Amino acid sequence: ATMQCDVVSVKESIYSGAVTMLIAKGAGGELGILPGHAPLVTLLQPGPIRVLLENGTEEIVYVSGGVLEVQPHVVTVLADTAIRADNLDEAAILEARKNAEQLLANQKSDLDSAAALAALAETAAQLETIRK
Amino acid sequence: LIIYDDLSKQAVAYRQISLLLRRPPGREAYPGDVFYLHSRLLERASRVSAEYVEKFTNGAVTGKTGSLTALPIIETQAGDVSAFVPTNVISITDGQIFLETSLFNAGIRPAVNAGISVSRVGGSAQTKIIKKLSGGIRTALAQYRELAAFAQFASDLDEATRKQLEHGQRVTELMKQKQYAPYSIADQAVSVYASNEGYMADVEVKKIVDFDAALIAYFRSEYAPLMKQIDETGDYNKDIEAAIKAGIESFKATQTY
Amino acid sequence: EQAASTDLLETGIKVIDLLCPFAKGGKVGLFGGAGVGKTVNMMELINNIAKAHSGLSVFAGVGERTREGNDFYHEMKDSNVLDKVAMVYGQMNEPPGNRLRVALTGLTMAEYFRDEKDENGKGRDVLLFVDNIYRYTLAGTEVSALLGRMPSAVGYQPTLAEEMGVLQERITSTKSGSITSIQAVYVPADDLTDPSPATTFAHLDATVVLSRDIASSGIYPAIDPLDSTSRQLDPLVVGQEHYEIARAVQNVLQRYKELKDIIAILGMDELAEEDKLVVYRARKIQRFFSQPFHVAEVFTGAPGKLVPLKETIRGFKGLLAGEYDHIPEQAFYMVGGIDEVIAKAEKL
Amino acid sequence: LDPLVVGQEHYEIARAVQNVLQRYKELKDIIAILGMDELAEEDKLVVYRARKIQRFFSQPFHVAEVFTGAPGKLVPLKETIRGFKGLLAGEYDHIPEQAFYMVGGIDEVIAKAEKL
Amino acid sequence: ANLKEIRAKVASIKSTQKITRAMQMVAASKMRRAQERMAQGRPYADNMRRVIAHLVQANPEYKHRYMVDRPVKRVGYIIVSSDRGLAGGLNINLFKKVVQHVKAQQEQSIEVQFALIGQKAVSFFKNYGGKVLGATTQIGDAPSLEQLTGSVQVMLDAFDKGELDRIYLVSNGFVNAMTQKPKVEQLVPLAPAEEGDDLNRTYGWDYIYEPEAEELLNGLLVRYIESMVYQGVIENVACE
């Protein structure tokens, strides 16, 4: 019986009820009840982490990237609500350079680097806010 | 049955005659007794008992009653129903049918305002089939009146309320008709049964009138004997319900509007 | 001549005796049109007054429709209530001089019924129904116009208040007996500022508002439990316990009214225990307000219940406390008193 | 104005025009209290078509040239029907409403819009 | 002041009140839905705090790249706003406060950059001009995390390239139903920490961290920073 097992990729979490033995996909040889100390933290394969709950009960364990930190009386897993990627910056720049530029249009053509420009005009927007 | 095309012009003529007699004036120049003028006329539309008929005819007619129906018409200025004569006449009748200028321009041809229109006699003046089938119209229209303002944002509403709104829209469109083309009891019953049972949830809102006209036309050429039984008798029986259902199913199966 | 201390008249109806208690010698305003069983309530009051207080009743119609009068007469004959009531009709097709002086004709009969001494005195308690006093004021206005009196303020007889004091004052609780009165009131143009309703409301002691919504709901009577008021619902005259019981049921109903829009638009799927409990208690109270009458026994086949006030107070206290949080809500429909509810519940 | 007298197309055109204008007559208060953006697109179309229709019913007269100084115009019935049928259909939805003023016939609308 | 126009105006105001009340109850329903949503995000928040405490206790002896401190030079910010209007003016209040802060920075001889997430922010700031690296809009209520990783990642890259020295969150934190405070709070503090407890009872053995001896920290902190930027996003959704 494991003390507790939780995964937190979204506003809610998936809890495990008294895991009778701690088996996980990509176990690494330290699978089982608390060893007195965890060996390490590892990037578990996005393959779903097969885990048998109390009395060897299997549950839907589909993972999209699993980081597991077992501990004496503590088992915590960090997982992805979505497919996991390492340095996904290339798609980030792809999205940024295509959506903003299309959205901005003249806003990007202007690209007025000045920030404290026409501060009285921002105060004019403020006075409009003052207007009913 | 008697119909007075306008009682407002009669009131104006009475006012003119009285003012020429210099009788004491009043609100809007009307004389002292304007309520009596229309009350004594509109109280003569009544149903008499068989005993009264027998006494009047000295026995020449037995076991028969009589009935006079009245439909006065009154014109109001700019929508003001609080004027003198309209308020005098509203309190006398047993009901009121309200026609709105905005509804007329909006496309509602018979242009009745169901919200304020009332009938004191109620369901006591209907055939059995009409009285049985009438409730699903009032329920739907009341629900649509309550939920009308939610048209813009409807996805957030649950499915039941959306279905009620769609049914209200379809019913409100079915209520349209054409002048010089009165419907019969059988057509009204068939249309109301098709509406209540939900066979027109499939159809588009815009094409309600065409579907209704085509369905009525098919029945009067295919199920005319059933219609004859409904028209003469008017009684609603399990067999009549089954026949109506089967006919509507056949029309929906094989026809193109 | 008349000495009175506030003394409630017990009709036997639950909602009225709880939220809008009457008073021997009071005047009551009835609000609502047709389709809500107004005549049924009037018949029930006529029957109950004679059943409990040995009191006869008088009916006076001011400008009544002939068809409605015929229906009322035939239905009262059918319900075996006509033996205890008198009738005076004033029809629309008559000149205004007739529809004006008919309330006095009914009042004379009611006053005579009051002053008939029983053995060991004790007079009698009698009632008086006036079909519509708005038409009484209009009859006065038309008569004044006919005689040529100059118009007052906004198209109303120079002499309007004096006349309504002549009528309404005579309905009082004297030493040897009492006369109450139930009157239906029409508000012209939805204007309480209009002189006629303003002159009317200065004499009323209670207002009963009949709602079409509750009638459509299927609970009869449909008397509104949030818009009806009284001048006897104070901690002094009616007793403290009654006062806070009525106040508690009123704000519970108020909360339910404020919440029913949300409960009807987006359903009950929201998660909040407290308002759900408020909803259930409101529904139980709404059903409990209904009761069967002795006028419909003939057409219904079920007997009536003249529930005493104490049982209503005790049952409402128990319902508010939370003791009857297990009884199904269907066990309160048309169930008379409090205990009956329990058996009805144990029957299920 | 009866389907038996004027015909069938004329009646539908007139009713659709009156319906559009009546619908636009009731959307002013909502635009005021809440932004124009708030109303759905099915009402943006009605508002814009109502404005275009309100200006397209304008034409210059032969008699009243002393006031404005613009030459007079005359339009036959069939041109009116054709133009309004095209307008209610959603065509001419890209032409600015400033080209429907004292322009008379549709082809003149097209030319005046081109000049702008 | 004729009676006809008064009557028409009363009718129209009654109708408009109907629509505005419908809007009010829809907003109230989504308001309860948000109250729950955040109520669910609060445990997401404290377990983010738990995991970052875990990592900072797991290896505070080494030094992270984010730890480096250099003088301020062209610091850019992150701004978030709404899609539709009728927001009561909290967006404008946020814009006023952030423009005052960036103008103070300009007077300190440092120019600023920013990213825009709300449609109103895009329309307003760019109408008066500005400096932006990336932006997005129409993400909708409760949007996917992958939708908005672009802005945070591009600004983290800009900091990596050395042009960007610091970034602070700019949003409206929830206080009460009616009280919303514009907040300009830093977001990349070099991730400092200091724990004087839980080392006695545990963490003496720590771990071999075979997969990543020191590499994992940066991934944990990028997940962390996207976590509170998502928290601020849902927060501003709730208060709007």
Side-chain angles (χ1 to χ4, degrees):
Chain A
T2 306
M3 294 300 293
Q4 64 180 20
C5 295
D6 279 293
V7 63
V8 291
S9 64
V10 290
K11 283 158 185 148
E12 65 274 18
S13 301
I14 291 95
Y15 183 55
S16 64
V19 189
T20 180
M21 294 300 293
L22 267 186
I23 186 167
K25 166 175 288 304
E30 295 302 320
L31 83 81
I33 319 299
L34 66 96
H37 54 70
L40 53 82
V41 303
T42 179
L43 195 287
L44 285 81
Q45 293 177 335
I49 309 306
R50 181 177 181 170
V51 176
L52 275 199
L53 301 196
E54 185 55 61
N55 72 276
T57 299
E58 199 268 341
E59 76 275 13
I60 168 63
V61 287
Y62 166 60
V63 77
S64 300
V67 188
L68 188 147
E69 293 177 350
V70 58
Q71 293 177 335
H73 323 298
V74 175
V75 183
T76 62
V77 201
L78 300 314
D80 289 345
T81 181
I83 309 309
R84 181 179 180 274
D86 300 60
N87 291 320
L88 186 36
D89 205 8
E90 66 269 13
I93 316 321
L94 279 198
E95 196 274 334
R97 293 182 183 174
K98 69 169 51 56
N99 81 309
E101 280 71 1
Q102 178 267 353
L103 179 67
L104 291 172
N106 55 347
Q107 306 170 359
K108 179 59 163 60
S109 305
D110 191 3
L111 205 52
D112 162 82
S113 173
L117 83 155
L120 199 144
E122 271 88 10
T123 325
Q126 159 186 354
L127 79 78
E128 171 54 297
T129 314
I130 298 306
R131 298 181 180 181
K132 203 65 185 57
Chain B
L1 160 63
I2 184 174
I3 294 176
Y4 317 95
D5 214 351
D6 221 335
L7 290 182
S8 310
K9 295 170 175 52
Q10 182 216 8
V12 175
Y14 183 54
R15 176 177 69 182
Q16 155 177 352
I17 286 193
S18 43
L19 278 177
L20 295 174
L21 275 66
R22 302 179 58 91
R23 295 181 174 178
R27 183 178 173 183
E28 296 179 351
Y30 279 117
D33 61 356
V34 152
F35 190 73
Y36 188 53
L37 174 76
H38 286 176
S39 77
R40 66 186 190 181
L41 157 78
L42 263 186
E43 201 86 337
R44 301 168 67 171
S46 51
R47 173 173 186 186
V48 289
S49 66
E51 286 94 332
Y52 180 73
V53 182
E54 180 174 2
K55 178 181 177 181
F56 190 75
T57 63
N58 275 305
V61 165
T62 54
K64 300 179 201 172
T65 66
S67 60
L68 182 53
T69 308
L71 294 182
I73 301 182
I74 186 167
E75 149 146 40
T76 55
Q77 310 263 49
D80 189 8
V81 296
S82 310
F84 200 29
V85 166
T87 46
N88 285 353
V89 168
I90 282 192
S91 63
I92 302 183
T93 65
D94 313 300
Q96 279 95 56
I97 305 175
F98 280 102
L99 311 171
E100 309 280 340
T101 307
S102 50
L103 291 189
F104 192 66
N105 286 300
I108 324 287
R109 302 296 179 192
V112 184
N113 183 0
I116 171 65
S117 297
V118 71
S119 182
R120 294 181 100 72
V121 160
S124 172
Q126 299 177 304
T127 65
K128 293 179 179 179
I129 172 165
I130 290 292
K131 187 172 180 176
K132 285 295 304 303
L133 304 187
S134 170
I137 299 298
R138 193 192 316 287
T139 294
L141 295 174
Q143 275 154 357
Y144 180 64
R145 277 174 269 172
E146 293 296 327
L147 278 76
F150 293 49
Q152 188 169 358
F153 43 97
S155 71
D156 49 356
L157 299 194
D158 54 348
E159 307 317 291
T161 44
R162 295 180 65 253
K163 179 188 316 301
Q164 295 179 61
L165 194 71
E166 306 289 295
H167 193 71
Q169 295 184 5
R170 257 92 176 183
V171 161
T172 314
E173 183 140 347
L174 175 137
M175 300 270 323
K176 293 179 181 171
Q177 207 173 341
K178 302 179 182 302
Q179 184 185 356
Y180 301 130
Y183 274 3
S184 175
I185 294 169
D187 289 345
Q188 293 184 51
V190 166
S191 309
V192 171
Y193 188 97
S195 64
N196 285 353
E197 197 78 358
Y199 289 113
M200 331 184 291
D202 191 4
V203 296
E204 290 84 3
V205 186
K206 64 179 180 180
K207 211 174 306 305
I208 281 294
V209 184
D210 309 335
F211 169 76
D212 166 64
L215 166 65
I216 291 306
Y218 175 86
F219 262 62
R220 300 200 71 76
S221 178
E222 187 74 14
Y223 312 102
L226 170 63
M227 297 296 180
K228 175 170 173 61
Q229 173 186 358
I230 296 181
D231 290 334
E232 277 87 332
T233 71
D235 310 357
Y236 198 18
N237 289 284
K238 293 179 179 179
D239 302 332
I240 297 180
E241 167 175 359
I244 291 183
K245 180 181 177 185
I248 298 179
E249 291 272 359
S250 166
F251 170 88
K252 291 255 296 181
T254 311
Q255 208 83 351
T256 59
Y257 295 93
Chain C
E1 249 186 15
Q2 61 289 342
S5 62
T6 53
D7 179 10
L8 276 53
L9 174 74
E10 175 159 355
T11 75
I13 313 168
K14 285 191 295 181
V15 55
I16 298 174
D17 265 3
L18 172 81
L19 295 190
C20 329
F22 294 115
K24 297 190 180 183
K27 307 145 201 56
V28 192
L30 207 63
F31 287 116
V36 289
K38 177 171 59 57
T39 57
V40 180
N41 308 124
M42 289 186 20
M43 305 213 282
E44 175 72 9
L45 289 168
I46 292 182
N47 170 239
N48 287 4
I49 191 67
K51 175 183 309 171
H53 305 68
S54 307
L56 298 189
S57 317
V58 180
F59 182 92
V62 184
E64 206 191 10
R65 308 192 181 76
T66 298
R67 178 180 76 76
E68 318 271 271
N70 188 253
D71 299 4
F72 196 48
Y73 167 68
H74 273 291
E75 157 187 13
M76 292 177 72
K77 188 165 53 55
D78 290 5
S79 183
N80 320 69
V81 175
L82 169 66
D83 49 0
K84 47 189 47 56
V85 59
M87 297 296 180
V88 186
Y89 273 167
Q91 295 104 0
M92 257 170 185
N93 58 355
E94 311 294 302
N98 298 116
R99 310 175 313 250
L100 181 69
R101 310 275 195 241
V102 79
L104 319 181
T105 299
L107 199 58
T108 287
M109 295 183 178
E111 293 184 306
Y112 178 77
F113 274 168
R114 172 186 65 190
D115 285 335
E116 297 177 9
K117 293 179 179 179
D118 289 345
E119 39 86 29
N120 289 337
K122 185 195 168 57
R124 191 180 321 189
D125 301 9
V126 175
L127 262 69
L128 167 78
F129 296 79
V130 180
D131 187 16
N132 208 356
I133 61 171
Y134 179 65
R135 292 203 279 269
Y136 169 71
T137 299
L138 295 174
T141 303
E142 293 177 350
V143 163
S144 77
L146 285 185
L147 295 174
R149 302 184 198 158
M150 209 159 286
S152 178
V154 48
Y156 274 114
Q157 36 180 328
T159 59
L160 188 147
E162 181 65 15
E163 293 177 350
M164 292 177 72
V166 164
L167 169 71
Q168 291 270 109
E169 170 285 336
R170 295 174 60 175
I171 307 176
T172 188
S173 55
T174 182
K175 301 173 179 297
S176 62
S178 170
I179 295 178
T180 70
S181 173
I182 308 156
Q183 304 168 356
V185 158
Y186 183 65
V187 182
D190 296 323
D191 204 13
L192 298 131
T193 293
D194 203 75
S196 180
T199 310
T200 299
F201 282 18
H203 296 72
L204 259 49
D205 290 39
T207 55
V208 180
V209 169
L210 286 79
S211 165
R212 185 182 295 276
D213 160 45
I214 313 178
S216 74
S217 179
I219 287 83
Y220 290 60
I223 297 182
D224 196 298
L226 277 187
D227 298 301
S228 316
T229 72
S230 177
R231 302 186 72 177
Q232 278 69 234
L233 198 69
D234 54 350
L236 189 143
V237 175
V238 175
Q240 296 82 15
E241 63 185 342
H242 191 160
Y243 180 80
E244 293 177 350
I245 285 302
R247 298 314 306 182
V249 302
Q250 271 177 353
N251 40 350
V252 168
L253 292 172
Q254 181 57 237
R255 276 294 323 151
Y256 191 61
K257 159 182 289 302
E258 301 171 2
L259 198 136
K260 183 190 183 69
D261 304 6
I262 311 180
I263 214 68
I265 296 323
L266 301 106
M268 183 176 282
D269 209 5
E270 87 272 8
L271 290 201
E273 174 188 61
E274 180 266 355
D275 53 48
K276 286 194 178 62
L277 182 170
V278 173
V279 160
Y280 310 139
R281 295 208 179 185
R283 294 183 181 277
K284 281 184 172 49
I285 290 179
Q286 284 178 355
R287 311 281 145 80
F288 193 70
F289 268 134
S290 70
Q291 71 167 55
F293 282 175
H294 301 76
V295 178
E297 297 185 352
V298 284
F299 330 103
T300 301
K305 293 291 175 53
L306 193 73
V307 184
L309 171 61
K310 294 309 293 172
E311 303 327 291
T312 88
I313 304 301
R314 184 172 62 81
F316 275 121
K317 176 186 287 291
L319 185 42
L320 280 167
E323 301 168 77
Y324 318 103
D325 279 354
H326 62 300
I327 307 297
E329 53 189 2
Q330 304 83 0
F332 299 81
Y333 190 90
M334 213 73 52
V335 72
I338 168 65
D339 300 4
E340 315 180 13
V341 175
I342 298 301
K344 185 166 181 295
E346 293 177 350
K347 196 285 308 304
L348 166 82
Chain D
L1 193 57
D2 221 18
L4 275 74
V5 176
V6 296
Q8 192 55 51
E9 195 167 356
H10 199 170
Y11 199 60
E12 300 146 357
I13 295 297
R15 303 283 84 163
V17 157
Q18 281 207 355
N19 181 342
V20 162
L21 286 180
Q22 174 51 240
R23 174 54 172 170
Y24 175 65
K25 196 183 177 290
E26 288 172 358
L27 293 171
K28 290 186 184 295
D29 298 294
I30 294 169
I31 293 172
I33 303 301
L34 294 315
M36 188 90 177
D37 301 351
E38 292 298 348
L39 295 174
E41 314 321 294
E42 297 80 0
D43 273 355
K44 311 290 221 329
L45 268 302
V46 161
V47 163
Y48 290 166
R49 280 163 184 174
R51 296 187 67 74
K52 287 190 223 304
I53 280 177
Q54 276 181 300
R55 285 127 175 75
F56 186 71
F57 268 127
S58 70
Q59 70 173 356
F61 278 166
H62 279 292
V63 168
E65 293 177 350
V66 317
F67 310 117
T68 63
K73 291 293 177 47
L74 190 144
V75 180
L77 167 68
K78 51 176 310 304
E79 290 316 300
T80 300
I81 301 299
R82 200 267 303 272
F84 273 105
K85 183 187 195 310
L87 190 49
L88 275 66
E91 185 46 61
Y92 320 122
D93 58 327
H94 44 49
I95 295 169
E97 59 180 56
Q98 294 82 2
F100 293 85
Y101 176 77
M102 297 296 180
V103 65
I106 179 61
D107 300 302
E108 297 142 357
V109 175
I110 310 173
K112 177 169 188 171
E114 190 280 336
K115 102 178 169 50
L116 283 181
Chain E
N2 49 20
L3 296 200
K4 183 178 179 180
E5 268 337 297
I6 301 179
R7 199 180 311 123
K9 190 59 180 303
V10 170
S12 48
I13 294 300
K14 285 173 175 174
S15 181
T16 59
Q17 187 181 12
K18 296 178 181 179
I19 294 169
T20 289
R21 285 193 67 252
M23 293 177 182
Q24 179 190 0
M25 325 329 155
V26 158
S29 81
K30 294 188 173 182
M31 159 31 54
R32 316 275 147 63
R33 175 75 268 176
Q35 282 167 296
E36 316 157 53
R37 286 182 157 177
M38 179 67 181
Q40 288 176 356
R42 178 76 268 172
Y44 187 76
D46 289 345
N47 289 337
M48 289 320 99
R49 295 176 64 186
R50 178 74 270 173
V51 301
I52 191 66
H54 282 170
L55 188 147
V56 299
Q57 195 181 183
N59 36 21
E61 293 177 350
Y62 292 68
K63 300 178 180 179
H64 213 280
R65 60 155 293 95
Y66 304 133
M67 298 187 180
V68 181
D69 297 5
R70 68 178 303 275
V72 163
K73 189 262 179 187
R74 294 183 181 277
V75 291
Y77 295 90
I78 284 188
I79 324 294
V80 296
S81 173
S82 55
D83 193 0
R84 55 179 289 182
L86 303 177
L90 82 154
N91 287 308
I92 308 180
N93 196 10
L94 199 75
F95 305 147
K96 292 189 292 185
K97 183 178 179 180
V98 72
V99 79
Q100 288 154 1
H101 289 46
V102 304
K103 176 185 177 183
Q105 198 49 239
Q106 300 262 132
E107 183 178 2
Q108 295 314 294
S109 175
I110 284 95
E111 278 81 1
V112 306
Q113 313 88 295
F114 50 88
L116 300 180
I117 318 293
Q119 181 64 80
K120 280 311 190 67
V122 174
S123 71
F124 177 82
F125 262 18
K126 304 290 109 176
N127 182 58
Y128 291 72
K131 178 66 172 64
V132 55
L133 277 304
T136 174
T137 190
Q138 276 92 71
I139 65 182
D141 300 335
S144 310
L145 268 297
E146 183 178 2
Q147 185 64 60
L148 69 171
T149 189
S151 59
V152 46
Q153 209 152 6
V154 71
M155 295 232 194
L156 195 75
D157 156 25
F159 177 80
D160 277 359
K161 295 313 179 59
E163 189 279 340
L164 182 44
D165 308 16
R166 294 183 181 277
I167 313 100
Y168 329 124
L169 286 211
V170 180
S171 72
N172 312 53
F174 195 98
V175 180
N176 196 353
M178 68 193 88
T179 58
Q180 285 77 240
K181 183 178 179 180
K183 183 169 71 172
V184 175
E185 183 65 13
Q186 64 180 20
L187 188 147
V188 52
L190 62 80
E194 197 293 312
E195 47 279 0
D197 188 22
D198 191 37
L199 294 86
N200 46 355
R201 47 183 175 271
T202 59
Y203 269 81
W205 47 90
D206 268 344
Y207 314 92
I208 294 169
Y209 312 115
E210 183 178 2
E212 295 85 357
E214 190 184 358
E215 293 177 350
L216 62 80
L217 293 88
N218 58 16
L220 261 295
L221 330 179
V222 297
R223 296 161 190 235
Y224 176 77
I225 59 173
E226 63 185 342
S227 178
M228 292 177 72
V229 175
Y230 178 65
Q231 186 173 355
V233 161
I234 60 189
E235 259 272 351
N236 68 53
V237 161
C239 55
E240 84 183 8

